[PDB]
Amino acid sequence: GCGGLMAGCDGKSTFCCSGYNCSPTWKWCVYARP
Structure with a gap:
């Protein structure tokens, strides 16, 4: 659904x-930085 930080x-x-x-290494959603 909606997950961040x-x-x-x-x-x-x-x-x-x-x-x-x-x-993929922490399995969580954080700020994006390409």
Whole structure:
């Protein structure tokens, strides 16, 4: 659903809320920085 700032993601393809990005090494959603 909507997860951001160390939010539980669990999935390298899981999408966060908005502006966040799930990390495959930490399994959570944090700020995105390409």
